[PDB]
Amino acid sequence: GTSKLKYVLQDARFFLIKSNNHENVSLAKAKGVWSTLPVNEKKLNLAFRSARSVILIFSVRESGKFQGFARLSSESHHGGSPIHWVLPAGMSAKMLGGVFKIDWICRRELPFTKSAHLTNPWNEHKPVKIGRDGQEIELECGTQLCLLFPPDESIDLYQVIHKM
Template identity: 90%
Template structure:
């Protein structure tokens, strides 16, 4: 699938994609009282592709969005907020995990617990998602060709 967000979140997500093995996005439609699923970010954002006809909330238009990310859905099942009232997010002042603006980061332990609350989604081929995740890990662990590492690569270790 594809997804887009505001430019301020786009920069954070691109940086996270470059530095982490996996970035998981948890989706919730405002005022729905539920999470609508979660997906793994599978690319940095890209600009200038074919136009996408987004379904957007009132008061928002496509010009407000940044580039387009590719995502791999892991679960497209809904999870009512009532099922996760016991989860608080340390990275949002220990507020309930259901509370957060677009782009709010969720601490890894809390995020894992949240994702485990979703019912399994039999319509998703998790083997493909895992294969893509492993492929990304191999790509990041192999040295880039072309001789000398860049300054950024040299300072990572």
């Protein structure tokens, strides 16, 4: 069904996350964590306090798809177990910063060809696939985008609802 998913997304905020590679999304799916640059980290921490759910929608650059979406379960924190992210050649791991805990809502992919009818008012009404890492997606567009993903029958949203 879609009813618990709609409940989780009600009055949520949504952010596009762009990963340079599949490896970091695979790590995020295995470990329930994400890290971003400080500019986006500050935005996500503000949003986490502001809304009942903050949803990250992931897309690997050049893949032509989204790889799934997840809900922040924490603000960012330092000092945890290190994550061996793959970073650009010139970048150190400290340039990233804190680690957000996330609960996956859908680990399945959605090709950009399926979201061509959705535009993001917060990015000049460009197709929702277009945007920089951290771009906020307006509520209606983000909700409709999440509802386009194939159902992930491995997920039980019961425990996520209780965290809200």
